[PDB]
């Protein structure tokens with residue numbers, strides 16, 4: 001199964017920077033969302049979930065087709081809460097109707113990471129909307145009540161290795177869980193992209209508790225929380241080494257996250273030899289906007 005990237009007709013870097021800027025300005029404007037976290041974290045989660053359906057074995061799923069717009073995927077229990085991100089992006093799509101859905105959802109994640117002071121994430125255009133019958137079935141996204149062995153095996157399907165997995169999970173520095181969405185009780189939350197997920201894992205006094213949905217999660221007296229799959233990164237000796245590496249080197253985490261996040265967003269896509277180079281967008285701050 002082959003998905004060839006096809007640049008939206010006549011568009012170039014400046015077109016996509018305009019879309020980036022619209023997303024970033026709206027991120028700034030709609031600041032009250034989710035107890036003043038804003039929409040940055042849910043947009044990152046949206047980009048991960050539309051990409052995280054990919055299966056390396058037959059190239060089904062993945063960001064290319066923009067299939068989250070269809071009811072089957074939109075209504076995946078695993079995607080509960082992402083409707084807020086979709087609604088956020090709706091007026092952006094209305095202003096720029098030429099951008100494909102996959103391009104918009106993935107660009108939403110890149111914009112959010114950068115505007116939350118994360119690393120630059122190079123981004124490529126050319127995802128093409130595919131028909132409703134190409135929508136992957138529910139159940140391809142990961143469970144949170146599992147251990148390190150599960151996390152490792154799960155991510156092999158996305159062609160991600162240990163370092164990639166531990167880097168991607170650092171996105172859990174952002175936002176929070178919501179009991180009504182996932183059955184996990186949210187803890188302290190931030191909207192600034194840092195390596196503090198790793199510092200929290202290593203430095204907090206974690207207690208295994210049961211929440212009001214009767215699920216186990218790890219909580220600290222400081223008010224932070226970790227999913228069982230988060231905590232599994234310091235239970236497994238290979239993951240633990242990498243957690244310590246990123247806890248002690250912010251730049252290395254940023255660089256590794258940027259590579260893994262772009263790879264995640266591009267899995268499944270064949271780029272022509274003469275496709276444009278990846279774009280690196282300027283932030284609003286860098287533009288003086």
Ligand code: HEM
Pocket residue numbers: 041042044045048080081142143144145151168169171172174175176177178179181182183184227229261
């Ligand atoms: C084993 C892998 C993963 C599991 C089991 C997992 C599970 C979860 C769960 C249960 C939530 C709470 C959703 C809610 O209640 O609203 C969440 C939130 C989040 N996840 Fe993950 N996740 C995983 C990997 C990732 C990856 C790879 C990324 C991106 C690189 C990511 C980004 C996020 C973000 C940014 C949020 C916060 C969303 C918000 O504040 O609304 N996650 N995750």
Ligand SMILES: N=C(N)c1ccsc1
Pocket residue numbers: 171172173174175176177187188224225226227230
């Ligand atoms: N471990 C956390 N505080 C987390 C998990 C999903 S989003 C934030």
